[PDB]
Every structure is written in structure tokens, then in C-alpha cells.
Amino acid sequence: MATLLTTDDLRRALVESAGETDGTDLSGDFLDLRFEDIGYDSLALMETAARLESRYGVSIPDDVAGRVDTPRELLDLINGALAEAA
């Protein structure tokens, strides 16, 4: 089976890059919102991505990380990779 990410799994991943002890983070519902709207800048989003990528054994195109406007869309981007991952 292709072990894919759920909203919850992605949620905690967002909570990873938000976990720098600062504030201004999403925590909870975020999936349908823009990264921009949830306080997710280029560094913050890539940190989420890198957390997921490296753990599950994938790699996301840096340009496409900036092409994902919603976590929903980012989720699918990784899930598409996960089907072809390990």
C-alpha cells in the first residue's frame, strides 16, 4: 500500500516548522488556507516540506514548493510522491 499523509500528519508537520517557540502559527485548521495567510513564508514552508521529505524519503522541487498555495495542494504533492516512495 502507498502510505499517504492525512490532514493530521500534515498538521503536525506544519506544527514542526512552527515549533521554534515564537508564535504567529497556525495550530489546528489550515489545510484550505494559503500558506501566506497562515504565516508561512518561503523558509517556514520549506521547513515543513523538508521535515516530511527527508522522513519519508522524497524530494520536492523548490519551484513547486512555491507553486503550492494551499496545504491541501501541498499534501497532494507529497502524497503523489509517496505513492512512488518507500
Side-chain angles (χ1 to χ4, degrees), residues 16-55:
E16 293 294 293
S17 44
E20 188 62 84
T21 314
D22 289 290
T24 53
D25 67 272
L26 53 98
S27 36
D29 180 75
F30 63 105
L31 189 70
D32 312 295
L33 290 66
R34 298 296 177 194
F35 298 93
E36 189 291 295
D37 190 79
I38 57 181
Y40 268 66
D41 72 278
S42 63
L43 187 168
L45 200 179
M46 69 85 180
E47 183 54 61
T48 311
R51 284 295 291 145
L52 296 177
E53 301 176 313
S54 314
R55 185 190 303 157

